Design a protein around this ligand. Structure first.
Ligand SMILES: CCCCCCCCCCCCCC(=O)O
Lengths: 35, 202
């Protein structure tokens, strides 16, 4: 759902979200995170 | 962004606020108008069901597929508020174009907005223009909740799992002229909204 995504970042303890590989840890160009 | 068959000229998401009947404030969230990206590294973030991104990249052409990273400008207040999106495509050949916008959460399609639009001859080219296309309510509600978030790093963590898929079809052929896979962060810059364009491969 929507709020689950938001609650996850607000309160780390009761976080209920599918674990995924962070974007920063994938095979992506160095310029992909440089604004 | 674009091939020799269809070029993207303008993309814009905005909030328009009407003060009095003669005064309008417009704020742009993102606007349009580098190294390549392995499309396998991002399949999980977009729908892979019947007609998903894996399917479409096989279908071709591979030069027509793009990943756009947006740094969104969320620096605005929030009556008479209009949430919109403007887009424009230019071609050298006439067509009946179909535009697909999928709002996705954790790779799951949340809402599809589908639009059919015809060309108009302009300066020896064929222009397709969606003017002030309403943002669906999920999107308005989503923007609102990002704003209630105290910190502009919390926003980033949340946006990590939110993507937009934009696909332009030739309605007669069923050929893809443009695909844009959109990834999202909030702007840190004093210059406002920014973007990186990468083509997808592999
Ligand atoms: C940080 C999130 C801000 C959102 C960035 C704007 C994205 C442009 C697409 C808006 C969705 C239009 C499609 C629809 O609502 O049906």
């Amino acid at each position: 759902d929507l709020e689950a995504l938001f609650n996850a970042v607000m309160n780390p303890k009761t976080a209920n979200v599918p674990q995924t590989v962070p974007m920063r840890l994938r095979k992506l160009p160095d310029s992909f995170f440089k604004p | 962004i674009g091939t020799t068959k269809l070029r993207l000229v303008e993309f814009s998401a905005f909030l328009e606020q009407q003060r009095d009947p003669d005064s309008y404030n417009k704020h742009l969230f993102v606007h349009i108008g580098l190294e390549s990206v392995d499309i396998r590294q991002i399949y999980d973030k977009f729908p892979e069901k019947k007609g998903g991104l894996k399917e479409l990249f096989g279908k071709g052409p591979q030069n027509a597929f793009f990943l756009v990273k947006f740094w969104a400008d969320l620096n605005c207040n929030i009556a008479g508020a209009f949430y919109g999106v403007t887009s424009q495509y230019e071609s050298s050949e006439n067509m009946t174009v179909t535009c697909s916008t999928k709002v996705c959460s954790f790779g799951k399609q949340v809402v599809e907005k589908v639009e059919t639009e015809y060309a108009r001859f302009e300066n020896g080219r064929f222009v397709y223009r969606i003017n002030r296309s309403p943002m669906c309510e999920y999107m308005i509600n989503f923007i609102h909740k990002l704003k209630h978030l105290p910190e502009k790093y919390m926003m980033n963590s949340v946006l990590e799992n939110f993507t937009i898929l934009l696909v332009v079809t030739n309605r007669d052929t069923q050929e893809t002229l443009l695909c844009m896979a959109c990834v999202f962060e909030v702007s840190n810059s004093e210059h406002g909204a920014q973007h990186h364009i990468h083509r997808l491969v592999k």
